[PDB]
UniProtKB/Swiss-Prot annotation:
UniProt protein name: Transcription initiation factor TFIID subunit 1
Full-length numbering of the shown residues: 788 to 872 of 1893
Family: Belongs to the TAF1 family.
PTM comment, free text: Phosphorylated by casein kinase II in vitro.
Organism, as annotated: Homo sapiens
Taxonomy, superkingdom: Eukaryota
Disease: Dystonia 3, torsion, X-linked: An X-linked dystonia-parkinsonism disorder. Dystonia is defined by the presence of sustained involuntary muscle contractions, often leading to abnormal postures. DYT3 is characterized by severe progressive torsion dystonia followed by parkinsonism. It has a well-defined pathology of extensive neuronal loss and mosaic gliosis in the striatum (caudate nucleus and putamen) which appears to resemble that in Huntington disease.
Subunit structure as annotated in this protein's UniProt entry: Component of the TFIID basal transcription factor complex, composed of TATA-box-binding protein TBP, and a number of TBP-associated factors (TAFs), including TAF1, TAF2, TAF3, TAF4, TAF5, TAF6, TAF7, TAF8, TAF9, TAF10, TAF11, TAF12 and TAF13. Interacts with TAF7; the interaction is direct. TAF1, when part of the TFIID complex, interacts with C-terminus of TP53.
Subcellular compartments: Nucleus
Function according to Swiss-Prot or TrEMBL: The TFIID basal transcription factor complex plays a major role in the initiation of RNA polymerase II (Pol II)-dependent transcription. TFIID recognizes and binds promoters with or without a TATA box via its subunit TBP, a TATA-box-binding protein, and promotes assembly of the pre-initiation complex (PIC). The TFIID complex consists of TBP and TBP-associated factors (TAFs), including TAF1, TAF2, TAF3, TAF4, TAF5, TAF6, TAF7, TAF8, TAF9, TAF10, TAF11, TAF12 and TAF13. TAF1 is the largest component and core scaffold of the TFIID complex, involved in nucleating complex assembly.
Record comment regarding domains: The Bromo domain mediates interaction with histones that have acetylated lysine residues at specific positions. The second domain also recognizes and binds histones that are butyrylated and crotonylated.
Amino acid sequence: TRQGYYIRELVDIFVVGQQCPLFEVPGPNSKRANTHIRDFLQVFIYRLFWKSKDRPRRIRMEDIKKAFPSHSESSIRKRLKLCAD
DNA sequence: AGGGCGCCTATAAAAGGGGGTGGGGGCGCGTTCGTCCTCAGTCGCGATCGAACACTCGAGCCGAGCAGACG
């Protein structure tokens, strides 16, 4: 860590074979992919509103632009359309 | 024991029935040939349904442009 080194011994190590997947990874540009993209952004926006101390709760746009910098700001504008002014 | 007698022999002919033997015919008859015939297997559909592929449309997401207000 930042403060120093720490040492443990280990005695047990597992080898994991070939995985049998139980969850389907979406494809690129899929409907499930884009749904997750906007849902994740919406959850981050709600949790930034919960963390806000001023009443009424207020956030800044460039916090979201620091978190999601590949997003066009139009997508963020629409996620803020419903729930913020 | 031996002379005379009986017999078989060759010869003709008839008469009639009986018996023996060989051949032919009958007939039935047994053997051989013809004919039916159905089941089993193959295949050929072709009946049916299920699965795949193609097409259309609807919805969702992203980007861009315009409007409004602050600086």
